[PDB]
Ligand binder design. Structure first.
Ligand code: E6E
Ligand code: MG
Ligand code: ZN
Length: 329
C-alpha cells in the first residue's frame, strides 16, 4: 500500500507542481513517459476537481492515459511533454493573486482540460504545411484552423472510449458550457488569432476595473473567456519565460520539428518557410525575433493585467532574450 522508490522520487518532483519552472522533462522520465497523466492527476486532486465534478478516479486515469497515448511520441515538440507543460503553466497562471476567487470551478476545469487536449494528435507539421500538401486534415476542416479543430475533435471523441467519460456526472447545462469554453480556448491557440487576441487583451488592460482586494472584475462571458483564452495562449507561449535549461530543450525540439518539416518541404511543392533551414537560418536570431515580436508583447500585456504578479516571469523572459542576443556572432 506504499509507493515504489521511483513513485516516491516522482512524488517529490511533483511537489513543485505549483511553481513556474517545474522540472517537466525529469517528470516525464520518472513517470515512464506519463507526464501529462501524472501532472493532470495531481492538479485535479489538488484543486478538488474529482469531488466537485463527481469524476470517478479510474475513469480519470483511463481517459488521461488514453489522451496521452494519442500524442505522438515521435514528434519532438508537440508531444505529451509539451501538453503537460502547458497544463502545468495554466495551472500556475490560474493561481495568480490578481485572479483569486475570480473563476468558477467549471471555468477552471475548462482551462485545464483545454490545456491538456490542446495539441492532441499533432503530426509535427504546421497548418500551412497541411493545407499546401492537400492533406486529409486540411480538407476535413476546409483549411480553417486545421490542427486546432482536430485537437478538439480528438480530445472530445476520446471521452467515448471505454470508461473514459470523465464528464459523465455533469448536467447537460454544465457540459454545454464546458464544451463551448473548451472550444473557444483551443481555437484561440491558432497563431493566426494572436494579434486580435493581443489587441483585445490590450483594450482590456486600458479599461481595467477591479474589485475590493484588487482582483480583476470580469462580469460578462466575453471578458471572462478572453482572459482564459489569453491565459492558455500565454501558457502555450511560455517556453522563453522559463529558466534557460528548460527553454533550450524546448528550442531544440521546436527546431528539430521545424528542420524536419524542411526535409519534407524539399519534395512536396513549396519552397521552404523563413528561418527554417540550417542552410541559412540562425536559431538564435529566430528566438530573439520570436521574443521581440510575439512573446514579449504578450507577456508584458499579461503582466500589466495581473500587475505585479508576473514580474519575475517577465524578468526571466528579458534575461533569456539577452542571452540569446549575446550568442549572435
Ligand atoms: C520565428 O520563430 C520561429 C521560427 C522557427 C522556429 C521557431 C521559432 C520560434 O520558436 C518557437 C516557436 C513556437 C511557435 N511557433 N509558431 C509560429 C510563430 C510565428 N512564426 C514565425 N515565422 C516566421 N518568422 C517569425 C518571426 C517571428 S514569429 C515568426 C511561425 C511559427 C507556431 O505556430 C507554434 C504553434 C503555437 C504556439 C507556439 C508556436 C513555439 C516555441 C518556440 O521556441 C521555444
Ligand atoms: Mg497548437
Ligand atoms: Zn501548444
Amino acid at each position: 500500500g506504499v509507493k515504489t522508490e521511483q513513485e516516491d522520487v516522482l512524488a517529490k518532483e511533483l511537489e513543485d507542481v505549483n511553481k513556474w519552472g517545474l522540472h517537466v522533462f525529469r517528470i516525464a522520465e520518472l513517470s515512464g513517459n506519463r507526464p501529462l497523466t501524472v501532472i493532470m492527476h495531481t492538479i485535479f486532486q489538488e484543486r478538488d476537481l474529482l469531488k466537485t465534478f463527481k469524476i470517478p478516479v479510474d475513469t480519470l486515469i483511463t481517459y488521461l492515459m488514453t489522451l496521452e497515448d494519442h500524442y505522438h511520441a515521435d514528434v519532438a515538440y508537440h508531444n505529451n511533454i509539451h501538453a503537460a507543460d502547458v497544463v502545468q503553466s495554466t495551472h500556475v497562471l490560474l493561481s495568480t493573486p490578481a485572479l483569486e476567487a475570480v473563476f468558477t470551478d467549471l471555468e477552471i476545469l475548462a482551462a485545464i482540460f483545454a490545456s491538456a487536449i490542446h495539441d492532441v494528435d499533432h503530426p509535427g507539421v504546421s497548418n500551412q504545411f497541411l493545407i499546401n500538401t492537400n492533406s486529409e486534415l486540411a480538407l476535413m476542416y476546409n483549411d480553417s484552423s486545421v490542427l486546432e479543430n482536430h485537437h478538439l475533435a480528438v480530445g472530445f471523441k476520446l471521452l467515448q472510449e471505454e470508461n473514459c467519460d470523465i464528464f459523465q456526472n455533469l448536467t447537460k447545462k454544465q457540459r454545454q458550457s464546458l464544451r463551448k469554453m473548451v472550444i473557444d480556448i483551443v481555437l484561440a491557440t491558432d497563431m493566426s488569432k494572436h494579434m486580435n487576441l493581443l489587441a483585445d487583451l490590450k483594450t482590456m488592460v486600458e479599461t481595467k476595473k477591479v474589485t475590493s482586494s484588487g482582483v480583476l472584475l470580469l462580469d460578462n462571458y466575453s471578458d471572462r473567456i478572453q482572459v482564459l483564452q489569453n491565459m492558455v495562449h500565454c501558457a502555450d507561449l511560455s517556453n522563453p519565460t522559463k529558466p534557460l535549461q528548460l527553454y533550450r530543450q524546448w528550442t531544440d525540439r521546436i527546431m528539430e520539428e521545424f528542420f524536419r518539416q524542411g526535409d519534407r518541404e524539399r519534395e512536396r511543392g513549396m519552397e521552404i518557410s523563413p528561418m527554417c533551414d540550417k542552410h541559412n537560418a540562425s536559431v538564435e536570431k529566430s528566438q530573439v525575433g520570436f521574443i521581440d515580436y510575439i512573446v514579449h508583447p504578450l507577456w508584458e500585456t499579461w503582466a500589466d493585467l495581473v500587475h505585479p504578479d508576473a514580474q519575475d516571469i517577465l524578468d526571466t523572459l528579458e534575461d533569456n532574450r539577452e542571452w540569446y542576443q549575446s550568442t549572435i556572432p
